[PDB]
Design an enzyme around this catalytic site. Structure first.
Site, PDB file in Angstrom:
ATOM      1  CE  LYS C 177      -3.639  -2.484   0.316  1.00  0.00           C
ATOM      2  NZ  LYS C 177      -4.621  -2.811  -0.809  1.00  0.00           N
ATOM      3  CE  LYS C 203      -2.710 -10.130  -3.544  1.00  0.00           C
ATOM      4  NZ  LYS C 203      -2.975  -8.798  -3.765  1.00  0.00           N
ATOM      5  CG  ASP C 205      -3.670  -3.296  -3.805  1.00  0.00           C
ATOM      6  OD1 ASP C 205      -4.634  -4.189  -4.127  1.00  0.00           O
ATOM      7  OD2 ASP C 205      -3.402  -2.242  -3.221  1.00  0.00           O
ATOM      8  CE  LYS C 335     -10.338  -3.948   2.348  1.00  0.00           C
ATOM      9  NZ  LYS C 335      -9.073  -3.004   2.195  1.00  0.00           N
TER      10      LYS C 335
HETATM   11  O1  LIG Z   1      -7.310  -4.086  -2.435  1.00  0.00           O
HETATM   12  C1  LIG Z   1      -7.669  -4.655  -1.193  1.00  0.00           C
HETATM   13  O2  LIG Z   1      -8.579  -4.120  -0.245  1.00  0.00           O
HETATM   14  C2  LIG Z   1      -6.705  -5.858  -0.687  1.00  0.00           C
HETATM   15  O3  LIG Z   1      -5.428  -5.530  -1.122  1.00  0.00           O
HETATM   16  C3  LIG Z   1      -6.643  -5.763   0.903  1.00  0.00           C
HETATM   17  O4  LIG Z   1      -5.890  -4.605   1.560  1.00  0.00           O
HETATM   18  P1  LIG Z   1      -5.991  -4.584   2.760  1.00  0.00           P
HETATM   19  O5  LIG Z   1      -4.893  -5.802   3.419  1.00  0.00           O
HETATM   20  O6  LIG Z   1      -4.973  -3.387   3.229  1.00  0.00           O
HETATM   21  O7  LIG Z   1      -7.061  -4.557   3.468  1.00  0.00           O
HETATM   22  C4  LIG Z   1      -7.275  -7.155  -1.159  1.00  0.00           C
HETATM   23  O8  LIG Z   1      -7.420  -7.091  -2.757  1.00  0.00           O
HETATM   24  C5  LIG Z   1      -8.709  -7.494  -0.594  1.00  0.00           C
HETATM   25  O9  LIG Z   1      -8.698  -8.266   0.426  1.00  0.00           O
HETATM   26  C6  LIG Z   1      -9.641  -8.124  -1.756  1.00  0.00           C
HETATM   27  O10 LIG Z   1     -10.787  -8.817  -0.968  1.00  0.00           O
HETATM   28  P2  LIG Z   1     -11.129 -10.186  -1.019  1.00  0.00           P
HETATM   29  O11 LIG Z   1     -10.053 -11.070  -0.412  1.00  0.00           O
HETATM   30  O12 LIG Z   1     -12.439 -10.064  -0.446  1.00  0.00           O
HETATM   31  O13 LIG Z   1     -11.530 -10.732  -2.515  1.00  0.00           O
HETATM   32 MG   LIG Z   2      -5.781  -5.583  -3.438  1.00  0.00          MG
END
Ligand SMILES: O=C(O)[C@@](O)(COP(=O)(O)O)[C@H](O)[C@H](O)COP(=O)(O)O
Ligand SMILES: [Mg+2]
Ligand SMILES: O=C(O)[C@@](O)(COP(=O)(O)O)[C@H](O)[C@H](O)COP(=O)(O)O
Ligand SMILES: [Mg+2]
Ligand SMILES: [Mg+2]
Ligand SMILES: [Mg+2]
Lengths: 480, 138, 480, 120, 239, 120
Positions: C177, C203, C205, C335
């Protein structure tokens, strides 16, 4: 106690912890939209107790640069620029807790020419957020500068008409039926009879790929024989949509290359292959002088319900950018969902060089198409020649009218079914061109042509009272 | 440095009582247990040396604790780990592996880099312990 | 009058015209399901005045062999075999006009090894039918004989743990991030700090592909440097999910081949690339000894609303078949949307060799997985180490717990954030293994570990009261 | 020619090919052994004794990792070779690539442990 | 020593030789699964070898067994992977000859590989001293394993469509003499045979490429002959 | 800066690939290869993580005389577009032509994210 504790950020915005997305830079009602910005309109339904601006700011944040807690690494970037901004939040008319959220994204957020990247941001995670119980993407403004990084349609309707030598009327087509079970040789029989009887095209069904009952190569071979038989019989250019949809890119290429080697004017693909295979095929089709028909298989899984998913007009934009030459876009009067004003929006999104805002048609953004070629809309599913006046009026001149059941269901055979449709079409086109009120007179225009066309008489007798009158799920929020 | 292979290596070195509880857990799942040791700490040293055969169909944790002590008499200067294996179809693999002995000092690794094509490099993990022969490392 | 009129079919079933789908062979309450049949369960909401069996029969027909009017060409095929059969139609509990429709499809309808073909039939057109105002695909029974035509996961959790040399605990990870805006060199910095501080993985994003602010090659190069630095620092195998998502198959291959050349243990792809590119990558990953992480970008566009779309458990089945090694599957407490019993169904669908019917978890079909490898579920989004007891209980041992904001948001730095998560995890695992009631004692287990771990103390102080309590949209119809 | 059809002739109730004389002029059109025992011994640096080996067991069911373990233990203990069983190709219980990767690790561990050339 | 102390004392996995029929390879109560590969063998045991032990030996040595006990079984799901001889019957009108039915789990085999299937089923068992003879009579290939194979490239249905020949056998002929003809003479025989009424002719099995005729001229003359015969008759023909 | 300038595209690629194989951080090309070879090399350099230096050989044949030709600032724009990483742009005080204000314009054209009208 340590150097880490000592160098902690004391700044209120960038100190650790959770703060509302609307106080993180993702809400700006004074933001001045740039002509290079990507804009998105979302229909936002917050959970009880969630503020509408905060929900909108969360969508903006989690589709651009934000996460759920503050991160210092923001400050390594030009974060004021990269943050998306919800800039207008409005109540949706005739709803209690539903909002239109307009969100701006800088052009630098996106990979040039990539539908996968655009969608990774805009639709990647935000539809699953606990805090919004529903979310729908209604429209997008794709700026000219980003559009220029995409091919647009491989062929487009202008070059398509030139290849086919067919102007001033809709194209005609038909899906071969039954959907599954026919052999390659029987497929070729149906294609020959339909084309020879008057249709411009036939097509493989979306689920006809390669199967125990028929492997793909014999279908393509018999189909091109049928096509060339029909060309020699009529003196018209004809085509059959050979479906190259397959499990892997290598298999799709093998099928597309074989179709090319046989000399087909046209192939088809299914939306279920996904965006990257579709873009790959769009480029292949431009390189290989091929009309690329897209069947929209699976689109209604997310496009049907007004409160949640993606409105089809957005898919029209992405697939036009991706390089398809046809896409299925509705009939209004057939067996599948299709409000007339929504459909008008879809057809205009696919065909026009420029769109003005038109709220009754669901066109929320002014859209310059940057001279990208035009996608031929395809009207298909449960239609018949008794509706020809309605089809010409609702759908216009630039469309493929596809009659599967409406050709092959004809009691006197496939040629008769094709002939009925072709005569009905030309009779309606000539009447429209003469200035006649062809919508009011349509049933009589068809009866008059039937006086010297047995096949059309029979088709009118069989199907004239078949209608599909149901309340639409996908409807406008504004009226004229 | 601390070698952080093993399931519990961000926690302090396990006591004999903690180890016995992990052995009890393995026994309660009908997992086979074995003991292995090494003086090559490389992250891809897949085959640590076997201390006897794995113990299958184990009723008593004390049998495992006995062999742990016996292995330690010979090899407490180097790494010793305890593994548990599950031969249920679809697993047929290790399901738990934790360190029970470490050397007093682990010097760790030199990251070796070589120039390759354009900006690419080739990398190697060189164990400082392996600068000396087996028997003289720790 | 003619030979066509003379040879018309007089048979009532195959004479021309429209007849109900339930009288065309698509309704059979006495049909004996074969072990080779593909079964689908649909949640069907008919329009007012439409009969529930007729709606169900329409779905069966238009997802197999039928169209809207009778066609003689049926008789060229073994049509009794190829027609799908709605064989059970039931009222959904606690609803007024909503039905469970169980539909059987013969194995010969489908192309071997093709998710595109399976989905072309099952979801191609039926979600847009006027006559049903809503439709959701809830579950499918994929027979062993059809499963054997698919690769299954390239690596699978068993081989993944062996490559990583990590057993008896969840994996840990973190998304870098801010989401967008970081340079390649800054990306590498974050990866180094996170891995060196205790995480197994980091990973890209989902929306980090190749962009003006950072092109892909420098990111991969700095990322592998960071990985190898962290391996030398810790003696653990480490990895970073290099995102190879791109516009075309050739670009995806170029990125995957480069990652392979650098020696990454792992890459990632986004669901938005689509099924054919995903299958192509699944095969590539098996051929090239690569862990293939699937981010589910866009899944919530169709998976969120109970009345319409596709339940995520079906997507789990298709992606396991397609050959991905990880898929995002929920957190419960984070979330994003995640009812605990639905999530339990998802995790079991991904990990088990065999599933029994379990209505409270939304598992409607007995499912033999035919020894296909297991997909590692990924729990990600808005989670923190204060929830570690809840994560271990809801999600189990076989999962990647990803803490993006929950690592990088740590006030004492990225290493501290990683260390907090790693210590919290091991503390909870050891307590569970000792037989302790770690759910009841969880907060105290974390406090005890914090006594000798400053980073964990700080993380608990900052986030311990952060919760995401909202009513679920995706919920069961039955309880235990 | 030699075995194509004649073993199924009704007129002979049984037929067995016992030996053949392959003339030198025909033999010279064939490669013969890729390596041969002489070059093989030179590659292995092993002369004046039989080679030793062992097939890994059980025949089927082992994982790639466990295959490598057996190979390492056998070679390190004194064998010149080990081998995949004839029916070990690529299967649900073990795909071929991990077997080859673990096997070469085992081989090279055994070479370093003994100073002998080893193989699997 | 640690090796002594950790020796397996459990009767089944203790070191040594035990009969294959006591190793798990004989089970007359085994419930055959619809995914199992089944084999039927005609088993002629040596004098003094019991028919069940011989059949268990075949089952064991075509699945997971060897001649002595190995502890490494316990690293696998061995109960599943062992093949089971599940029925032995005397063969009618013979002495000392038996039918043995053997079941093999689908996971023992490489998908789509005849080499792998045969490597197990026929690899070693026909040479075992303990059986003086052995014949594989039949197999049940389950649908789930069949779906991993292509099956015929064309198949008779598509073949008839390509040839446009329905409702009768095809006709053919092998060119003679078997060896010695030139390419041009081969083409002559092909033309005369097809033009006179045959659907096909064929190269003899031993006609490949040889000093008396190299392959390319044969193919070139053969296709001339075929196309001459097609033009002469209006039928699709082939060589 | 290994100069890969050559008569044909195939020869240039041969030289660039060899430079890449040796591990150079940087190569050069001459402007006289022309726009299409330059764009080809710009793309190659992005694909192969190479710094691409452009020597402006021949530029002064059209850039020197105020009344006729092309001002170098236009060439700066096209070469920046084309994908080069360096370009020669003047010294002011050295042996080649270089008015200070013209040179500022050239440098700003090459380096800035945005230029405002600046007539001097
Ligand atoms: O882009 C985001 O929000 C994340 O990188 C999480 O960041 P944080 O760890 O900072 O929250 C993941 O891609 C989501 O968790 C995907 O959701 P899911 O796993 O429900 O598909
Ligand atoms: Mg993500
Ligand atoms: O499978 C079918 O039902 C069709 O072949 C039509 O057959 P008929 O012509 O016999 O109805 C088309 O694929 C649908 O029209 C697709 O719907 P849309 O155009 O809405 O995507
Ligand atoms: Mg269709
Ligand atoms: Mg063997
Ligand atoms: Mg012969």
């Amino acid at each position: 106690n340590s150097v880490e504790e000592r160098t902690r950020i004391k700044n209120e915005r960038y100190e650790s912890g959770v703060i509302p997305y609307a106080k993180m830079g993702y809400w700006d009602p004074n933001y001045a939209v740039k002509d290079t910005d990507i804009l998105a309109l979302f229909r936002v339904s917050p959970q009880p107790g969630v503020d509408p601006v905060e929900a909108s700011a969360a969508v903006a944040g989690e589709s651009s640069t934000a996460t759920w807690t503050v991160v210092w690494t923001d400050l390594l970037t030009a974060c004021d620029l990269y943050r998306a901004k919800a800039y207008k939040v409005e109540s949706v008319p005739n709803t209690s807790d539903q909002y239109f959220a307009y969100i701006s994204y800088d052009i630098d957020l996106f990979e040039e020419g990539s539908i996968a990247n655009l969608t990774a941001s805009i639709i990647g995670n935000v539809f699953g957020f606990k805090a919004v119980k529903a979310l729908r993407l209604e429209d997008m403004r794709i700026p000219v500068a980003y559009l220029k990084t995409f091919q647009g349609p491989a062929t487009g309707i202008v070059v398509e008409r030139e290849r086919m030598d067919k102007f001033g009327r809709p194209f005609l087509g038909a899906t071969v039926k039954p959907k599954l079970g026919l052999s390659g040789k029987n497929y070729g029989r149906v294609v020959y009879e339909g084309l020879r009887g008057g249709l411009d095209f036939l097509k493989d069904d979306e689920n006809i790929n390669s199967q125990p009952f028929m492997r793909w190569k014999e279908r393509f071979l018999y189909s091109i024989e049928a096509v060339n038989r029909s060309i020699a019989a009529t003196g018209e250019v004809k085509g059959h949509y050979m479906n190259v949809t397959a499990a892997t890119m290598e298999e799709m290429y093998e099928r597309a290359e074989f179709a090319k080697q046989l000399g087909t004017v046209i192939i088809m693909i299914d939306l279920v292959i996904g965006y990257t295979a579709i873009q790959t095929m769009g480029i292949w089709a431009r390189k290989n002088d091929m009309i690329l028909h897209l069947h929209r298989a699976g689109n209604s899984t997310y496009s049907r319900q007004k409160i949640h998913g993606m409105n089809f007009r957005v898919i029209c934009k992405w697939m036009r950018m991706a390089g398809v030459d046809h896409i299925h876009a509705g009939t209004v009067v057939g067996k599948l969902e299709g409000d007339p004003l929504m459909i008008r929006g879809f057809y205009n999104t696919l065909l026009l060089p420029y769109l003005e805002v038109n709220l009754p048609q669901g066109i929320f953004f002014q859209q310059d198409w940057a001279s990208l070629r035009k996608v031929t809309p395809v009207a298909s599913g449960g239609i018949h020649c008794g509706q020809m006046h309605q089809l010409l009026d609702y759908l216009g001149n630039d469309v493929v009218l596809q009659f599967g059941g409406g050709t092959i269901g004809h009691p006197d055979g496939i040629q008769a079914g094709a002939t009925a449709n072709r005569v009905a079409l030309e009779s309606m086109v000539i009447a429209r061109n003469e200035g006649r009120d062809y919508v009011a007179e349509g049933p009589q225009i068809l009866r008059d042509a039937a006086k010297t066309c047995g096949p059309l008489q029979t088709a009118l007798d069989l199907w004239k009272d078949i209608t599909f009158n149901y309340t639409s799920t996908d409807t406008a929020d504004f009226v004229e | 440095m601390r070698l952080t292979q093993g399931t519990f290596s961000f926690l302090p070195d396990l006591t004999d009582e903690q180890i016995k509880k992990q052995v009890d857990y393995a026994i309660s799942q009908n997992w086979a247990i074995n003991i292995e040791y090494t003086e090559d700490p490389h992250p891809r040293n897949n085959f640590w040396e076997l201390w006897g055969l794995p113990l299958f169909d184990i009723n008593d944790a004390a049998t495992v604790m006995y062999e742990i002590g016996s292995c330690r008499q010979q090899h407490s200067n180097v790494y010793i780990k305890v593994n548990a294996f599950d031969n249920t179809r679809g697993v047929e693999s290790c399901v738990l592996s934790f360190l029970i002995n470490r050397p007093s000092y682990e010097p760790g690794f030199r990251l070796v880099r070589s120039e390759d094509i354009s900006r690419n490099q080739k990398y190697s993990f060189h164990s400082y312990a392996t600068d000396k022969p087996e028997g003289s490392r720790y």
